[PDB]
mmCIF file of C-alpha atoms and ligand atoms in Angstrom:
data_model
loop_
_atom_site.group_PDB
_atom_site.id
_atom_site.type_symbol
_atom_site.label_atom_id
_atom_site.label_comp_id
_atom_site.label_asym_id
_atom_site.label_seq_id
_atom_site.Cartn_x
_atom_site.Cartn_y
_atom_site.Cartn_z
ATOM 1 C CA UNK Q 85 -13.720 19.255 18.029
ATOM 2 C CA UNK Q 86 -17.449 19.098 16.851
ATOM 3 C CA UNK Q 87 -16.820 19.137 13.013
ATOM 4 C CA UNK Q 88 -17.628 15.520 11.900
ATOM 5 C CA UNK Q 89 -17.194 14.340 8.270
ATOM 6 C CA UNK Q 90 -20.193 12.482 6.720
ATOM 7 C CA UNK Q 91 -20.234 10.479 3.487
ATOM 8 C CA UNK Q 92 -23.175 9.791 1.156
ATOM 9 C CA UNK Q 93 -25.151 6.689 2.320
ATOM 10 C CA UNK Q 94 -23.604 4.255 -0.264
ATOM 11 C CA UNK Q 95 -19.990 5.323 0.574
ATOM 12 C CA UNK Q 96 -20.668 5.353 4.349
ATOM 13 C CA UNK Q 97 -21.852 1.676 4.091
ATOM 14 C CA UNK Q 98 -19.381 0.458 1.433
ATOM 15 C CA UNK Q 99 -16.248 2.128 3.001
ATOM 16 C CA UNK Q 100 -16.282 -0.437 5.872
ATOM 17 C CA UNK Q 101 -15.839 -3.306 3.353
ATOM 18 C CA UNK Q 102 -12.292 -4.420 2.317
ATOM 19 C CA UNK Q 103 -13.370 -4.370 -1.396
ATOM 20 C CA UNK Q 104 -14.335 -0.641 -1.374
ATOM 21 C CA UNK Q 105 -13.231 1.365 -4.482
ATOM 22 C CA UNK Q 106 -12.744 5.115 -3.676
ATOM 23 C CA UNK Q 107 -14.185 6.142 -7.074
ATOM 24 C CA UNK Q 108 -13.110 8.509 -9.891
ATOM 25 C CA UNK Q 109 -13.708 11.873 -8.117
ATOM 26 C CA UNK Q 110 -10.208 12.962 -6.915
ATOM 27 C CA UNK Q 111 -11.864 15.849 -4.984
ATOM 28 C CA UNK Q 112 -13.566 13.372 -2.542
ATOM 29 C CA UNK Q 113 -10.404 11.322 -1.658
ATOM 30 C CA UNK Q 114 -9.200 13.758 1.066
ATOM 31 C CA UNK Q 115 -12.587 13.792 2.861
ATOM 32 C CA UNK Q 116 -12.591 9.981 2.494
ATOM 33 C CA UNK Q 117 -9.141 9.874 4.154
ATOM 34 C CA UNK Q 118 -10.182 12.338 6.914
ATOM 35 C CA UNK Q 119 -13.374 10.291 7.549
ATOM 36 C CA UNK Q 120 -11.248 7.100 7.929
ATOM 37 C CA UNK Q 121 -8.724 8.777 10.339
ATOM 38 C CA UNK Q 122 -11.614 10.305 12.421
ATOM 39 C CA UNK Q 123 -13.330 6.818 12.830
ATOM 40 C CA UNK Q 124 -10.011 4.806 13.157
ATOM 41 C CA UNK Q 125 -8.355 7.113 15.723
ATOM 42 C CA UNK Q 126 -10.998 9.541 17.115
ATOM 43 C CA UNK Q 127 -12.055 13.085 15.954
ATOM 44 C CA UNK Q 128 -9.407 14.625 18.349
ATOM 45 C CA UNK Q 129 -6.105 12.799 17.405
ATOM 46 C CA UNK Q 130 -5.289 15.379 14.572
ATOM 47 C CA UNK Q 131 -5.932 19.171 14.291
ATOM 48 C CA UNK Q 132 -8.206 19.254 11.188
ATOM 49 C CA UNK Q 133 -6.548 22.407 9.563
ATOM 50 C CA UNK Q 134 -3.037 20.776 9.854
ATOM 51 C CA UNK Q 135 -4.246 17.353 8.575
ATOM 52 C CA UNK Q 136 -5.774 18.985 5.500
ATOM 53 C CA UNK Q 137 -2.642 20.984 4.781
ATOM 54 C CA UNK Q 138 -0.574 17.752 5.232
ATOM 55 C CA UNK Q 139 -2.934 15.697 2.942
ATOM 56 C CA UNK Q 140 -2.629 18.278 0.108
ATOM 57 C CA UNK Q 141 1.212 18.573 0.308
ATOM 58 C CA UNK Q 142 1.285 14.734 0.165
ATOM 59 C CA UNK Q 143 -1.068 14.752 -2.886
ATOM 60 C CA UNK Q 144 1.208 17.394 -4.552
ATOM 61 C CA UNK Q 145 4.312 15.081 -4.262
ATOM 62 C CA UNK Q 146 2.627 12.063 -5.922
ATOM 63 C CA UNK Q 147 3.262 12.097 -9.704
ATOM 64 C CA UNK Q 148 0.979 11.498 -12.715
ATOM 65 C CA UNK Q 149 1.949 7.803 -13.297
ATOM 66 C CA UNK Q 150 -0.523 5.028 -14.287
ATOM 67 C CA UNK Q 151 -0.417 2.995 -10.999
ATOM 68 C CA UNK Q 152 1.859 4.386 -8.172
ATOM 69 C CA UNK Q 153 -0.210 7.605 -7.892
ATOM 70 C CA UNK Q 154 -2.401 9.530 -5.360
ATOM 71 C CA UNK Q 155 -5.356 7.136 -5.916
ATOM 72 C CA UNK Q 156 -3.138 4.117 -5.001
ATOM 73 C CA UNK Q 157 -2.051 6.032 -1.855
ATOM 74 C CA UNK Q 158 -5.649 6.500 -0.602
ATOM 75 C CA UNK Q 159 -6.633 2.927 -1.725
ATOM 76 C CA UNK Q 160 -3.718 1.449 0.351
ATOM 77 C CA UNK Q 161 -4.770 3.681 3.346
ATOM 78 C CA UNK Q 162 -8.412 2.466 2.954
ATOM 79 C CA UNK Q 163 -7.240 -1.186 3.160
ATOM 80 C CA UNK Q 164 -5.271 -0.373 6.349
ATOM 81 C CA UNK Q 165 -8.458 1.355 7.679
ATOM 82 C CA UNK Q 166 -10.543 -1.817 7.013
ATOM 83 C CA UNK Q 167 -7.849 -4.024 8.730
ATOM 84 C CA UNK Q 168 -7.623 -1.702 11.777
ATOM 85 C CA UNK Q 169 -11.478 -1.538 12.124
ATOM 86 C CA UNK Q 170 -11.828 -5.434 11.973
ATOM 87 C CA UNK Q 171 -8.944 -5.802 14.574
ATOM 88 C CA UNK Q 172 -9.811 -2.771 16.789
ATOM 89 C CA UNK Q 173 -8.446 -4.036 20.182
ATOM 90 C CA UNK Q 174 -5.042 -5.253 18.751
ATOM 91 C CA UNK Q 175 -3.360 -1.827 18.038
ATOM 92 C CA UNK Q 176 -2.304 1.235 20.088
ATOM 93 C CA UNK Q 177 -3.685 4.795 19.592
ATOM 94 C CA UNK Q 178 -0.209 5.707 18.106
ATOM 95 C CA UNK Q 179 -0.075 2.717 15.683
ATOM 96 C CA UNK Q 180 -3.553 3.637 14.289
ATOM 97 C CA UNK Q 181 -2.349 7.293 13.664
ATOM 98 C CA UNK Q 182 1.017 6.186 12.219
ATOM 99 C CA UNK Q 183 -0.125 3.318 9.957
ATOM 100 C CA UNK Q 184 -2.795 5.420 8.142
ATOM 101 C CA UNK Q 185 -0.192 8.222 7.484
ATOM 102 C CA UNK Q 186 2.426 5.589 6.433
ATOM 103 C CA UNK Q 187 -0.016 4.144 3.834
ATOM 104 C CA UNK Q 188 -0.917 7.607 2.498
ATOM 105 C CA UNK Q 189 2.837 8.466 2.210
ATOM 106 C CA UNK Q 190 4.259 5.012 1.350
ATOM 107 C CA UNK Q 191 4.854 5.813 -2.407
ATOM 108 C CA UNK Q 192 5.625 9.610 -2.296
ATOM 109 C CA UNK Q 193 7.412 10.949 -5.479
ATOM 110 C CA UNK Q 194 7.172 7.533 -7.248
ATOM 111 C CA UNK Q 195 8.170 7.731 -10.952
ATOM 112 C CA UNK Q 196 6.927 4.214 -11.931
ATOM 113 C CA UNK Q 197 10.402 2.513 -11.960
ATOM 114 C CA UNK Q 198 11.580 -0.359 -9.636
ATOM 115 C CA UNK Q 199 14.728 -0.294 -7.406
ATOM 116 C CA UNK Q 200 16.582 -2.515 -9.959
ATOM 117 C CA UNK Q 201 15.936 0.030 -12.771
ATOM 118 C CA UNK Q 202 17.355 2.768 -10.450
ATOM 119 C CA UNK Q 203 20.448 0.504 -9.930
ATOM 120 C CA UNK Q 204 20.954 -0.287 -13.639
ATOM 121 C CA UNK Q 205 20.370 3.377 -14.634
ATOM 122 C CA UNK Q 206 22.841 4.367 -11.823
ATOM 123 C CA UNK Q 207 20.322 6.897 -10.308
ATOM 124 C CA UNK Q 208 21.715 9.080 -7.462
ATOM 125 C CA UNK Q 209 19.134 7.583 -5.009
ATOM 126 C CA UNK Q 210 20.831 4.130 -5.515
ATOM 127 C CA UNK Q 211 24.134 5.745 -4.293
ATOM 128 C CA UNK Q 212 22.356 7.147 -1.151
ATOM 129 C CA UNK Q 213 20.619 3.787 -0.323
ATOM 130 C CA UNK Q 214 21.774 0.450 -1.895
ATOM 131 C CA UNK Q 215 18.670 -1.564 -0.653
ATOM 132 C CA UNK Q 216 15.007 -0.382 -0.423
ATOM 133 C CA UNK Q 217 16.077 2.583 -2.643
ATOM 134 C CA UNK Q 218 12.615 4.057 -3.533
ATOM 135 C CA UNK Q 219 11.243 3.152 -0.020
ATOM 136 C CA UNK Q 220 13.948 5.140 1.849
ATOM 137 C CA UNK Q 221 13.206 7.979 -0.612
ATOM 138 C CA UNK Q 222 9.416 7.686 0.154
ATOM 139 C CA UNK Q 223 10.154 7.916 3.912
ATOM 140 C CA UNK Q 224 12.492 10.980 3.534
ATOM 141 C CA UNK Q 225 9.755 12.687 1.425
ATOM 142 C CA UNK Q 226 7.361 12.019 4.437
ATOM 143 C CA UNK Q 227 9.838 13.587 6.936
ATOM 144 C CA UNK Q 228 10.234 16.591 4.481
ATOM 145 C CA UNK Q 229 6.513 17.288 4.277
ATOM 146 C CA UNK Q 230 6.227 16.811 8.121
ATOM 147 C CA UNK Q 231 8.917 19.580 8.629
ATOM 148 C CA UNK Q 232 7.101 22.183 6.411
ATOM 149 C CA UNK Q 233 5.564 25.078 8.382
ATOM 150 C CA UNK Q 234 2.076 24.206 9.705
ATOM 151 C CA UNK Q 235 2.305 20.520 8.570
ATOM 152 C CA UNK Q 236 3.385 18.827 11.878
ATOM 153 C CA UNK Q 237 0.195 16.768 12.470
ATOM 154 C CA UNK Q 238 2.123 15.084 15.382
ATOM 155 C CA UNK Q 239 2.945 18.415 17.209
ATOM 156 C CA UNK Q 240 0.747 17.381 20.251
ATOM 157 C CA UNK Q 241 2.917 14.250 20.956
ATOM 158 C CA UNK Q 242 5.868 14.222 23.455
ATOM 159 C CA UNK Q 243 9.400 14.101 21.900
ATOM 160 C CA UNK Q 244 9.294 10.347 22.915
ATOM 161 C CA UNK Q 245 5.894 9.604 21.274
ATOM 162 C CA UNK Q 246 6.823 11.571 18.078
ATOM 163 C CA UNK Q 247 9.975 9.361 17.799
ATOM 164 C CA UNK Q 248 7.845 6.165 18.316
ATOM 165 C CA UNK Q 249 5.319 7.183 15.558
ATOM 166 C CA UNK Q 250 8.099 8.253 13.052
ATOM 167 C CA UNK Q 251 9.747 4.832 13.681
ATOM 168 C CA UNK Q 252 6.383 3.011 13.088
ATOM 169 C CA UNK Q 253 6.065 5.042 9.832
ATOM 170 C CA UNK Q 254 9.716 4.351 8.735
ATOM 171 C CA UNK Q 255 9.465 0.554 9.314
ATOM 172 C CA UNK Q 256 5.982 0.556 7.681
ATOM 173 C CA UNK Q 257 7.158 2.422 4.518
ATOM 174 C CA UNK Q 258 10.373 0.295 4.264
ATOM 175 C CA UNK Q 259 8.212 -2.878 4.514
ATOM 176 C CA UNK Q 260 6.528 -2.002 1.147
ATOM 177 C CA UNK Q 261 9.879 -3.168 -0.443
ATOM 178 C CA UNK Q 262 8.380 -6.438 -1.774
ATOM 179 C CA UNK Q 263 12.005 -7.903 -1.771
ATOM 180 C CA UNK Q 264 11.750 -7.827 2.072
ATOM 181 C CA UNK Q 265 8.186 -9.315 2.157
ATOM 182 C CA UNK Q 266 9.338 -12.887 1.265
ATOM 183 C CA UNK Q 267 11.571 -13.529 4.324
ATOM 184 C CA UNK Q 268 9.140 -11.510 6.486
ATOM 185 C CA UNK Q 269 6.146 -13.756 5.572
ATOM 186 C CA UNK Q 270 8.464 -16.893 5.875
ATOM 187 C CA UNK Q 271 9.412 -15.904 9.501
ATOM 188 C CA UNK Q 272 5.779 -15.082 10.459
ATOM 189 C CA UNK Q 273 4.565 -18.492 9.068
ATOM 190 C CA UNK Q 274 7.308 -20.258 11.182
ATOM 191 C CA UNK Q 275 6.472 -18.147 14.344
ATOM 192 C CA UNK Q 276 2.696 -18.768 13.881
ATOM 193 C CA UNK Q 277 2.978 -22.564 13.293
ATOM 194 C CA UNK Q 278 5.347 -23.233 16.252
ATOM 195 C CA UNK Q 279 3.067 -20.915 18.384
ATOM 196 C CA UNK Q 280 5.967 -18.517 19.335
ATOM 197 C CA UNK Q 281 4.190 -15.528 17.667
ATOM 198 C CA UNK Q 282 3.634 -13.031 20.521
ATOM 199 C CA UNK Q 283 2.108 -9.570 19.736
ATOM 200 C CA UNK Q 284 3.681 -8.140 23.022
ATOM 201 C CA UNK Q 285 7.226 -8.768 21.592
ATOM 202 C CA UNK Q 286 7.811 -5.414 19.733
ATOM 203 C CA UNK Q 287 10.024 -7.189 17.081
ATOM 204 C CA UNK Q 288 7.034 -9.556 16.383
ATOM 205 C CA UNK Q 289 4.628 -6.570 16.073
ATOM 206 C CA UNK Q 290 6.999 -4.911 13.560
ATOM 207 C CA UNK Q 291 6.879 -8.085 11.362
ATOM 208 C CA UNK Q 292 3.006 -8.257 11.557
ATOM 209 C CA UNK Q 293 2.755 -4.505 10.711
ATOM 210 C CA UNK Q 294 5.183 -5.208 7.781
ATOM 211 C CA UNK Q 295 2.876 -7.979 6.483
ATOM 212 C CA UNK Q 296 -0.168 -5.677 6.874
ATOM 213 C CA UNK Q 297 1.681 -3.060 4.711
ATOM 214 C CA UNK Q 298 2.338 -5.671 1.957
ATOM 215 C CA UNK Q 299 -1.359 -6.721 2.172
ATOM 216 C CA UNK Q 300 -2.587 -3.092 1.992
ATOM 217 C CA UNK Q 301 -0.146 -2.318 -0.843
ATOM 218 C CA UNK Q 302 -1.258 -5.366 -2.958
ATOM 219 C CA UNK Q 303 -4.940 -4.750 -2.112
ATOM 220 C CA UNK Q 304 -5.832 -4.010 -5.793
ATOM 221 C CA UNK Q 305 -5.675 -7.868 -6.224
ATOM 222 C CA UNK Q 306 -8.470 -8.158 -3.520
ATOM 223 C CA UNK Q 307 -11.163 -5.983 -5.201
ATOM 224 C CA UNK Q 308 -14.122 -7.095 -7.304
ATOM 225 C CA UNK Q 309 -12.927 -8.584 -10.645
ATOM 226 C CA UNK Q 310 -13.908 -5.547 -12.818
ATOM 227 C CA UNK Q 311 -11.757 -3.221 -10.584
ATOM 228 C CA UNK Q 312 -8.817 -5.731 -10.386
ATOM 229 C CA UNK Q 313 -8.870 -6.173 -14.205
ATOM 230 C CA UNK Q 314 -8.788 -2.367 -14.911
ATOM 231 C CA UNK Q 315 -6.138 -1.696 -12.178
ATOM 232 C CA UNK Q 316 -3.903 -4.466 -13.729
ATOM 233 C CA UNK Q 317 -3.847 -2.451 -17.054
ATOM 234 C CA UNK Q 318 -2.500 0.469 -14.914
ATOM 235 C CA UNK Q 319 0.409 -1.460 -13.277
ATOM 236 C CA UNK Q 320 1.322 -3.107 -16.634
ATOM 237 C CA UNK Q 321 1.558 0.381 -18.268
ATOM 238 C CA UNK Q 322 4.336 1.226 -15.732
ATOM 239 C CA UNK Q 323 5.924 -2.244 -16.188
ATOM 240 C CA UNK Q 324 6.066 -1.782 -20.028
ATOM 241 C CA UNK Q 325 7.416 1.827 -19.684
ATOM 242 C CA UNK Q 326 10.183 0.426 -17.400
ATOM 243 C CA UNK Q 327 10.903 -2.395 -19.887
ATOM 244 C CA UNK Q 328 11.122 0.274 -22.624
ATOM 245 C CA UNK Q 329 13.727 2.148 -20.471
ATOM 246 C CA UNK Q 330 15.601 -1.189 -19.910
ATOM 247 C CA UNK Q 331 15.870 -1.715 -23.755
ATOM 248 C CA UNK Q 332 17.154 1.912 -23.952
ATOM 249 C CA UNK Q 333 20.030 0.942 -21.549
ATOM 250 C CA UNK Q 334 20.941 -2.117 -23.756
ATOM 251 C CA UNK Q 335 19.267 -4.692 -21.476
ATOM 252 C CA UNK Q 336 16.594 -7.186 -22.572
ATOM 253 C CA UNK Q 337 13.916 -6.746 -19.860
ATOM 254 C CA UNK Q 338 12.241 -9.715 -18.097
ATOM 255 C CA UNK Q 339 9.078 -10.747 -20.070
ATOM 256 C CA UNK Q 340 6.699 -9.211 -17.446
ATOM 257 C CA UNK Q 341 8.164 -5.724 -18.376
ATOM 258 C CA UNK Q 342 8.227 -6.448 -22.166
ATOM 259 C CA UNK Q 343 5.204 -4.881 -23.968
ATOM 260 C CA UNK Q 344 6.011 -7.103 -27.004
ATOM 261 C CA UNK Q 345 4.830 -9.947 -24.646
ATOM 262 C CA UNK Q 346 1.292 -8.612 -23.750
ATOM 263 C CA UNK Q 347 -0.010 -12.164 -24.604
ATOM 264 C CA UNK Q 348 1.898 -13.603 -21.535
ATOM 265 C CA UNK Q 349 0.012 -11.359 -19.017
ATOM 266 C CA UNK Q 350 -2.738 -13.810 -17.831
ATOM 267 C CA UNK Q 351 -0.065 -16.500 -17.109
ATOM 268 C CA UNK Q 352 2.068 -13.675 -15.497
ATOM 269 C CA UNK Q 353 -0.836 -12.961 -13.040
ATOM 270 C CA UNK Q 354 -1.227 -16.723 -12.206
ATOM 271 C CA UNK Q 355 2.498 -16.566 -11.289
ATOM 272 C CA UNK Q 356 1.972 -13.384 -9.187
ATOM 273 C CA UNK Q 357 -1.135 -14.695 -7.295
ATOM 274 C CA UNK Q 358 0.440 -18.127 -6.565
ATOM 275 C CA UNK Q 359 3.899 -16.742 -5.597
ATOM 276 C CA UNK Q 360 3.035 -13.435 -3.806
ATOM 277 C CA UNK Q 361 -0.612 -12.519 -3.252
ATOM 278 C CA UNK Q 362 -2.099 -15.884 -2.129
ATOM 279 C CA UNK Q 363 0.768 -16.601 0.319
ATOM 280 C CA UNK Q 364 0.583 -12.937 1.603
ATOM 281 C CA UNK Q 365 -3.191 -13.000 2.433
ATOM 282 C CA UNK Q 366 -3.027 -16.659 3.743
ATOM 283 C CA UNK Q 367 -0.334 -15.815 6.366
ATOM 284 C CA UNK Q 368 -2.259 -12.539 7.221
ATOM 285 C CA UNK Q 369 -5.582 -14.403 7.762
ATOM 286 C CA UNK Q 370 -3.706 -16.900 10.024
ATOM 287 C CA UNK Q 371 -2.302 -14.007 12.209
ATOM 288 C CA UNK Q 372 -5.406 -11.684 11.914
ATOM 289 C CA UNK Q 373 -8.464 -13.913 11.220
ATOM 290 C CA UNK Q 374 -10.878 -10.984 10.522
ATOM 291 C CA UNK Q 375 -8.729 -10.165 7.374
ATOM 292 C CA UNK Q 376 -10.198 -13.303 5.661
ATOM 293 C CA UNK Q 377 -12.327 -11.324 3.160
ATOM 294 C CA UNK Q 378 -8.981 -10.176 1.554
ATOM 295 C CA UNK Q 379 -7.916 -13.848 1.080
ATOM 296 C CA UNK Q 380 -11.363 -14.816 -0.223
ATOM 297 C CA UNK Q 381 -11.406 -11.887 -2.749
ATOM 298 C CA UNK Q 382 -7.772 -12.730 -3.833
ATOM 299 C CA UNK Q 383 -8.712 -16.426 -4.542
ATOM 300 C CA UNK Q 384 -11.762 -15.218 -6.607
ATOM 301 C CA UNK Q 385 -9.481 -13.027 -8.779
ATOM 302 C CA UNK Q 386 -6.889 -15.904 -9.223
ATOM 303 C CA UNK Q 387 -9.824 -18.017 -10.457
ATOM 304 C CA UNK Q 388 -10.929 -15.107 -12.781
ATOM 305 C CA UNK Q 389 -7.388 -15.086 -14.351
ATOM 306 C CA UNK Q 390 -7.660 -18.915 -14.850
ATOM 307 C CA UNK Q 391 -10.935 -18.279 -16.747
ATOM 308 C CA UNK Q 392 -9.041 -15.725 -18.943
ATOM 309 C CA UNK Q 393 -6.263 -18.307 -19.786
ATOM 310 C CA UNK Q 394 -8.954 -20.890 -20.796
ATOM 311 C CA UNK Q 395 -10.658 -18.416 -23.245
ATOM 312 C CA UNK Q 396 -13.803 -18.276 -20.905
ATOM 313 C CA UNK Q 397 -13.186 -14.440 -20.759
HETATM 314 O O1 IL6 C 467 1.279 -8.050 -11.117
HETATM 315 C C1 IL6 C 467 2.147 -7.633 -10.346
HETATM 316 N N1 IL6 C 467 3.399 -8.173 -10.316
HETATM 317 C C2 IL6 C 467 3.906 -9.224 -11.126
HETATM 318 C C3 IL6 C 467 3.459 -9.698 -12.393
HETATM 319 C C4 IL6 C 467 4.268 -10.724 -12.783
HETATM 320 N N2 IL6 C 467 5.178 -10.907 -11.782
HETATM 321 C C5 IL6 C 467 6.267 -11.886 -11.745
HETATM 322 C C6 IL6 C 467 6.033 -12.887 -10.599
HETATM 323 F F1 IL6 C 467 4.838 -13.556 -10.921
HETATM 324 F F2 IL6 C 467 7.101 -13.756 -10.402
HETATM 325 F F3 IL6 C 467 6.007 -12.277 -9.373
HETATM 326 N N3 IL6 C 467 4.933 -9.965 -10.767
HETATM 327 C C7 IL6 C 467 1.912 -6.580 -9.309
HETATM 328 N N4 IL6 C 467 2.992 -6.107 -8.644
HETATM 329 C C8 IL6 C 467 2.856 -5.213 -7.667
HETATM 330 C C9 IL6 C 467 4.100 -4.701 -6.964
HETATM 331 C C10 IL6 C 467 5.203 -5.634 -6.480
HETATM 332 C C11 IL6 C 467 5.432 -4.817 -7.760
HETATM 333 C C12 IL6 C 467 1.594 -4.727 -7.287
HETATM 334 C C13 IL6 C 467 0.464 -5.175 -7.964
HETATM 335 C C14 IL6 C 467 0.607 -6.122 -8.977
HETATM 336 N N5 IL6 C 467 -0.487 -6.607 -9.698
HETATM 337 C C15 IL6 C 467 -1.777 -6.074 -9.773
HETATM 338 C C16 IL6 C 467 -2.834 -6.825 -10.351
HETATM 339 N N6 IL6 C 467 -4.083 -6.326 -10.421
HETATM 340 C C17 IL6 C 467 -4.328 -5.111 -9.942
HETATM 341 N N7 IL6 C 467 -3.335 -4.393 -9.391
HETATM 342 C C18 IL6 C 467 -2.068 -4.814 -9.258
HETATM 343 MG MG1 MG C 468 6.183 1.407 -3.512
HETATM 344 ZN ZN1 ZN C 469 2.364 1.077 -3.211
#
């Protein structure tokens, strides 16, 4: 119980900030995750030997893809850590445990293809689950790793509590289906504006946790411009691979996935920021006012993409 994790001074300061980048040293990401769980939860919540074994099985089942990789996993967990630390009274001891594991696991075994490519390709996973295809896969990968010998980080919980935390995790991982985000944000907006939003209603919590997951998942659009710019090259590399695989099936891809249309990218990001990211972080700031630095950093990047369009960079 007396084995604290420390970080170098710059990381220890900078990790509390929403805009933190976890850096290029893979070998430090686990200790970064353990440090975040230990401060977010308490040093006790997880048996350190089990956590570490769980972290490394999770790392093993992320693939070597440009964007939806191990680094994205720990990045999305860091964003959740920032949110939880700036809203510390709002969430239960179980939610804090669950949400950081959810974020770490939310993209397990991702191959860099969307749900619609799975459907067009006729992948087996699309037969198993018609909606939220990859996301139900990501959850079942989480359950798999949890059922490996010596990996049950939730062993200490009652049957009841274990069921509650697996259901937080399932809803949280499903909520990273951006198709679901649109209605979910729409309903939260309506509930907030009419003043019916009530964080004691469990179905209202679920929605707010869903919006948090979208926010954490998109958080590469809320970093400092140089990090957002380089991370965008990563997601577009998957997009263009997927477009390539669309052409292989006899299907003209949408322009966003078409690498012959690299020129359209800056205008593509305007679209994305206006239609997804700005509305996401606006609604989140309304519900959780301490999350405002994510909205501010998102607006700055939107304005950086406008400068790109106008030849100013
Ligand atoms: O850019 C993304 N999605 C786009 C682009 C164009 N459209 C069409 C539109 F605009 F209608 F939505 N959608 C994007 N998507 C995602 C996931 C939902 C797929 C995550 C990050 C993303 N971006 C990014 C930028 N910088 C640094 N990291 C990630
Ligand atoms: Mg995903
Ligand atoms: Zn993700």
